């Protein structure tokens, strides 16, 4: 019966937000999670070992798979579901923080102060999804072609190499901006609707 | 002792099915991941190891793989699985939210609001189980031939590929096909019988 | 403390059952996953990476591979298990829906029914069962020969293929046999003693 | 506070056993099944991609795998294991059932039937026991020699094959050994404690 | 309800830090272990399988990997965060067994102590942090050439090896070496700021 | 709230042993466990299949690393910490099993018993682990050379055989001893405390 600490928690957390806007971002945290967990990482399980190029100098494969892929899709949506997930961790803590010492001042004696954090947080999540997108535009684009160039030392003038499945790659591509365009639209109606509240006072 | 309020919730979900809707949806829903969690992810493993073509070229294997799939069965089905499995959980959400804020409402004071949205999510699940159906059969088909023929650049004019053990494939696709057409059907008796209840007042 | 409910539960399931036959069909369900999570999956783990011809035709060995194993064993036991523990399930939903509904009604008021559908559910089993291994005996047999002949095109005339531990396999299908038949035998003896009380009125 | 009946239960199982054996048979069940969990089974994971033989028939490598060892020492011994812990599972849920009903009994009304189960079940442990070690003294002895000689079709009249790792598989065999002979000799000592103490009446 | 317990122990471990101090620790904490888990251990998957060199010679593929890296990043980094965790581990444990024996002597009887150990604890991580770092700063830098020469017996005069993937181990490297600085940091801060109120008396 | 009896067992084990032996066994014991779980099973993944000598001879490489590894560091060091971890095991189970029995002798009836265990137990980790650091002095040594020299049939004279990775393993052998010696240093001087306090009487 330990569960009614966890319901006030709960309560004064999501205190600002609306009520549609709660269960559309905790289901699509869920999605983006489990779809990361079980179908995404299991198609980037041989993206060294069947990537192979047109040539017969030694040590050729390695410099050209580097510079086809300065880094992997998959730790990069896992570093930018981390610093998604970051400052929501940081309100929360700071919010249990408060109500604890709250309580003992208040067992003890028998707006501006939490608004401010939520905004806060709720700018920086949209302000790390923009520049993540931006980032991933700015290196890779949003397709991936089955033949690449490759012209880098100690390799020969121009060799070809050919990727791993680059189609099944470009539909989990689309998929994770898919995502990612909702989640910043989601973000943005939670911050118009906030203050669109508060100029009315 | 911390299990009423979970029966409470379990009564106002599943207020309006059947008594025999209920049982089925949810064995066959443990039927369905446990199936996709044991016996169908290991067959296939080896989908791109065993590929093997009928020539010298280098580069040829990965871009007839590439046209043989454009995206695994078992993605595919993961993502109809979580696509059918979205708008309970967003029905599920809303409704316990719903009885916090009147619980609350009610500790204050001492149709037509919660049947709309559980007809839009048994809609929505027959919708995507439909499209999903439709796409597999659009894209691959319902079979698959041990002999593949292929006629992509930068291979010579038609070179023989052969798959990888798809007579189990085969198998386990008609599976998914009859399981995937039973959903449906009962998710279809479910909406005939909630609006053969509701025309008579 | 919240497990008498549980208890009332397992009263309600095994009201009809004999006080050898619980047990001993119990510890069965135990034994046959133990066993087949543990020792079985480990044995057909190259089932395919040592499957070797004796050939230079490039192709043979997928398509001779495929003639030989339709279907593993291990998805095949797997299949048969799920496909015999789905009507105790879907006895034990009925009855849980049951006994929230009954009690209900009578904290409102302050055979044939049940006995029915243990029959339904207590003849499927065996119907499966015996299904299961009447497939198996037409497809394998119940021993694996150390050289198979493979007539399979595009492969010349004749060629030896060789398989991959045959006898280890062929030990653990008997023993699934003799599970198989053990299960099959101790359900027939559930179904004869309900039948013989049942006829003394 | 749930758990004053499963101390009932701990000491309706354990009525007739010596204080001094119980300690040392669950310390050494606990032993068995983390030494086969964690050492054991990484040292037999290349038991066949590390087995060669000094010939150049294709398929010559399989059959003489398959003459050198007719079944894995690691599947063996969890089948042994396995068997070993039937019985007890088997007295423990007759002892459950027996308790219930008995508790049922005893709410309506406000030795040789349970010692003689005892007595198979710790007869059933020792003969399990002593069937598996001579099985295995019968089968492959108690070392492995590090060269292997092969007289099978279809290869040539004598050929070397040189195993994996002998050394190691015979140190973790001794120490197999030697647990089983303490298993043994405990159960024998129990029996005598329980059947010496019988005949004072 | 057995959870005040556990809050009085957490009360009386962070009696002396900032109330900004230990949210940030935490999330960092769980940020570093998040990290370390999950995107950083499969980029160091084939550290060696992929490690190709410019020669023939046999044997020397494994002195130029042995010459190249002494020890692997992910290990190095796995024992930095050992280390740093183990002085928290300390302070908890004395600080648990310290308030049992005290609430022994108060149920018996119906600065100095506490802070040294603290400031002991808030030492040592900040030492071990900044002898990790320089130990790193002095075997490897802070890069990863693509490029590596090998001088070492039984090679001959110089040859060319090429790494694997070294612009994704830059960028990690690159971002361990940022939450490093940023967690000795803010254990200097914690330190100034709790001898900044120690002056004061 | 069921944690006052655990409470009670953690009293009545720790009875005897200094309030300072206690916090750091415990954190050794959790140091020794991680360590061994996460960092240092993954530097002996290919301890065979990276091991390559200079010969053509086949069956050379098997026997070669047969004479190199009597048995591997990995499950020495499993074995070594299951054997000093069983007698704190053994003697939890007796002083539970006596707990037991004394409170229903005191339900009943509304120094040398438990010591001499204690010392016997704290005897036999010390004697364990000098006879495990004796064997592993004996047949190892503490470093490994690159280079190994290989003189046993069916190879040829005299063949130079290279090792895998052997820096990282000589500094992993260093902190297993220093963890070992550090274990052994604190147990001896639990048993001088308790011999100390046992002569003042």
Same mark, same amino acid.
């Given at each position: 019966?330990?569960? @009614? ?7 004064? /957390? ?28 299991? #198609? ?39 610093? /998604? ?44 999804? /923009? ?11 949003? @397709? ?37 365009? /909702?989640?910043? #639209? ?16």
């Amino acid at each position: 019966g330990d569960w @009614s600490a966890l319901g006030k928690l709960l309560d004064k /957390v999501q205190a600002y937000s609306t009520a549609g806007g709660k269960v559309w971002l905790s289901v699509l945290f869920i999605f983006r999670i489990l779809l990361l967990g079980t179908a995404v990482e299991s #198609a980037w399980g041989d993206e060294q070992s069947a990537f192979r190029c047109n040539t017969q100098q030694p040590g050729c494969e390695n410099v050209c798979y580097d510079k086809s892929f300065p880094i992997s899709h998959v730790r990069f949506w896992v570093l930018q579901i981390i610093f /998604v997930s970051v400052p929501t961790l940081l309100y929360l803590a700071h919010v249990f923080y408060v109500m604890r010492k709250e309580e003992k001042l208040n067992k003890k004696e028998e707006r501006g102060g939490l608004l401010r954090t939520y905004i806060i947080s709720i700018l920086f999540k949209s302000i790390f999804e /923009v520049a993540f997108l931006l980032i991933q535009w700015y290196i890779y684009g949003f @397709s991936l072609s089955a033949v690449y160039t490759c012209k880098r030392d100690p390799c020969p003038h121009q060799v070809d190499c050919f990727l791993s499945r680059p189609t099944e790659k470009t539909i989990f591509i689309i998929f994770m901006l898919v995502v990612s365009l /909702v989640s910043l #639209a989601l973000n943005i109606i939670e911050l118009f609707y906030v203050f669109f509240k508060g100029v009315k006072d």
